[PDB]
Design an enzyme around this catalytic site. Structure first.
Site, PDB file in Angstrom:
ATOM      1  N   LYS A   1      51.826  12.818  -7.485  1.00 50.52           N
ATOM      2  CA  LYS A   1      51.428  11.993  -8.636  1.00 50.52           C
ATOM      3  C   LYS A   1      50.089  11.251  -8.360  1.00 50.52           C
ATOM      4  O   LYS A   1      49.355  10.945  -9.307  1.00 50.52           O
ATOM      5  CB  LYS A   1      52.564  11.007  -8.966  1.00 50.52           C
ATOM      6  CG  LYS A   1      52.338  10.164 -10.214  1.00 50.52           C
ATOM      7  CD  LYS A   1      53.620   9.456 -10.624  1.00 50.52           C
ATOM      8  CE  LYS A   1      53.386   8.565 -11.800  1.00 50.52           C
ATOM      9  NZ  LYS A   1      54.656   7.902 -12.232  1.00 50.52           N
TER      10      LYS A   1
ATOM     11  N   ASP B   1      61.625  10.311 -16.059  1.00 51.47           N
ATOM     12  CA  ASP B   1      60.678   9.407 -15.412  1.00 51.47           C
ATOM     13  C   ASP B   1      60.233  10.215 -14.188  1.00 51.47           C
ATOM     14  O   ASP B   1      61.044  10.448 -13.299  1.00 51.47           O
ATOM     15  CB  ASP B   1      61.361   8.092 -14.978  1.00 51.47           C
ATOM     16  CG  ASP B   1      60.584   7.205 -13.998  1.00 51.47           C
ATOM     17  OD1 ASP B   1      59.374   7.464 -13.771  1.00 51.47           O
ATOM     18  OD2 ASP B   1      61.175   6.270 -13.464  1.00 51.47           O
TER      19      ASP B   1
ATOM     20  N   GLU C   1      55.011   4.581 -19.182  1.00 56.38           N
ATOM     21  CA  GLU C   1      56.147   4.012 -18.470  1.00 56.38           C
ATOM     22  C   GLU C   1      56.546   2.626 -18.978  1.00 56.38           C
ATOM     23  O   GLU C   1      57.716   2.474 -19.316  1.00 56.38           O
ATOM     24  CB  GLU C   1      55.883   4.014 -16.952  1.00 56.38           C
ATOM     25  CG  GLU C   1      55.971   5.428 -16.387  1.00 56.38           C
ATOM     26  CD  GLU C   1      55.369   5.662 -15.019  1.00 56.38           C
ATOM     27  OE1 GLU C   1      55.154   4.686 -14.268  1.00 56.38           O
ATOM     28  OE2 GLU C   1      55.114   6.838 -14.695  1.00 56.38           O
TER      29      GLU C   1
ATOM     30  N   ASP D   1      56.647  -3.924 -12.691  1.00 56.21           N
ATOM     31  CA  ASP D   1      57.145  -2.691 -12.109  1.00 56.21           C
ATOM     32  C   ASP D   1      56.816  -2.564 -10.619  1.00 56.21           C
ATOM     33  O   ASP D   1      55.718  -2.135 -10.259  1.00 56.21           O
ATOM     34  CB  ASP D   1      56.570  -1.510 -12.913  1.00 56.21           C
ATOM     35  CG  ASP D   1      57.168  -0.165 -12.585  1.00 56.21           C
ATOM     36  OD1 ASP D   1      57.865  -0.059 -11.551  1.00 56.21           O
ATOM     37  OD2 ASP D   1      56.949   0.783 -13.364  1.00 56.21           O
TER      38      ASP D   1
END
Ligand SMILES: Nc1ncnc2c1nc(Cl)n2[C@@H]1O[C@H](CO)[C@@H](O)[C@H]1O
Length: 385
Positions: free
Chosen positions: A71, A10, A175, A199
């Site tokens: 990211k 991840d 994800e 999330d």
């Protein structure tokens, strides 16, 4: 041996996690400091390059050369309004190389510039070495996850980060799909299964709705807030304690950078304690001008301090349901992802919104994505033979 082995990674905005599926179970691999998640930080110093915990630990002392949030840049053009907006909030320099962003730093006394995929490859190399130290042999096959809303360019640059890092990328998976795999939600037999993934991480909030029809995953909706996470809750605690210090001592600490950072890390720690105790104690020796700051806070006060932010997590939930054209009772499973979903008030708000429904939360939410990626990496490497 090594060729029949694969890891799941991840690659998170603020933290990364690596897992391996062997002997019928997922093992989330602890790093060399015993941590099951590793900060997605890369520091460039006068002598070395630091990755993870050591990089995050010296961020205050070296902010211009400590890279994080790569990211947010990966797979994007420099002119992208997301890049232009984010750049105003980073202490490191972002430069333009033919409409491609590069992070510019000082390393061993020299100016160096890196593509976001090069920064992310250093984080990935660390996750690869963490897996290798645990297994006792080098593992190179990997499944790497990405947000469900990532386009082709962001997916390709993440795969490129994997290649630079010496990993054979078996697949780039979403994800929320890895999270649904972690709970075995794709193995319930026949019929369409609607899954909502909530999330709430350290710096981003993502709501995803998936339909699982006989093992086939389909993304029905994505919603959320790219600038909402656990660090906003840490900051609400900071403002409270800055105001409490002012009431007790008639001194404003907000301008003392060191005092604010020590309070911030103590607040993050107290916040975690508040997820399993109804109070947490702060114990800061000589916080400002030799004044100790020994205090406490209830979970009730913390819930008040973040009340508006916790409540705001339900608007993207409703938005995702309308986009997916589904009512609440049409959602079969609710999955928690991200460390911040451990907050009891957050769980209560989501459960009440879904009319008292049970939540899938038995897997460490900050580990569920790497867990599923590890399961998928095992299936994929076994099919490759
Ligand atoms: N027990 C916890 N109670 C509240 N917040 C938590 C908890 N654990 C983590 Cl990690 N976080 C936060 O999750 C983020 C990483 O996913 C960070 O913001 C961390 O503080």
């Amino acid at each position: 041996m090594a060729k029949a082995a694969a890891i799941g990674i991840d690659l998170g905005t603020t933290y990364s996690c690596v897992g391996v599926f062997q002997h019928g179970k997922v093992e989330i691999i602890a790093n060399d400091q015993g941590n099951r998640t590793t900060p997605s930080y890369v520091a460039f110093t006068d002598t070395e390059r630091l990755i993870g915990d050591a990089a995050k630990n010296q961020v205050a002392l070296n902010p211009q050369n400590t890279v994080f949030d790569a990211k947010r840049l990966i797979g994007r053009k420099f002119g992208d309004p997301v890049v232009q907006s984010d750049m105003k909030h980073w202490p490191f320099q972002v430069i333009n190389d033919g409409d491609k962003p590069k992070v510019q730093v000082s390393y061993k006394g020299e100016t160096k510039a890196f593509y976001p995929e090069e920064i992310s490859s250093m984080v990935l190399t660390k996750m690869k070495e963490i897996a290798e130290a645990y297994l006792g042999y080098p593992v190179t096959n990997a499944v790497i996850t990405v947000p469900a809303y990532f386009n082709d360019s962001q997916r390709q640059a993440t795969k490129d980060a994997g290649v630079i890092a010496g990993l054979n990328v078996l697949r780039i998976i979403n994800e929320p799909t890895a999270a649904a795999i972690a709970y075995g939600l794709d193995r319930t037999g026949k019929g369409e299964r609607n899954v909502l993934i909530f999330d709430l991480g350290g710096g981003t909030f993502d709501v995803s709705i998936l339909t699982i029809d006989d093992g086939i995953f389909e993304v029905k909706a994505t919603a959320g807030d790219t600038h909402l996470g656990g660090e906003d809750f840490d900051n609400r605690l900071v403002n409270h304690f800055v105001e409490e210090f002012k009431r007790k001592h008639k001194k404003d600490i907000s301008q003392n950078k060191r005092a604010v950072r020590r309070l911030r890390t103590a607040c993050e720690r107290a916040k975690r304690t508040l997820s399993s105790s109804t109070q947490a104690s702060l114990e800061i020796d000589s916080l400002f001008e030799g004044i100790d700051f020994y205090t406490s806070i209830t979970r009730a006060r913390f819930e008040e301090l973040c009340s508006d932010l916790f409540r705001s997590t339900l608007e993207p939930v409703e938005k995702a349901l309308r986009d997916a054209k589904l009512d609440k009772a049409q959602i079969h499973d609710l999955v928690l992802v991200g460390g911040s979903t451990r907050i009891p008030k957050v769980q209560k708000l989501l459960q009440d919104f879904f009319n008292g429904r049970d939540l899938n939360k038995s897997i460490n939410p900050d580990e569920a994505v790497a867990y599923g990626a590890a399961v998928q990496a095992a299936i994929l490497i076994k099919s490759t033979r």
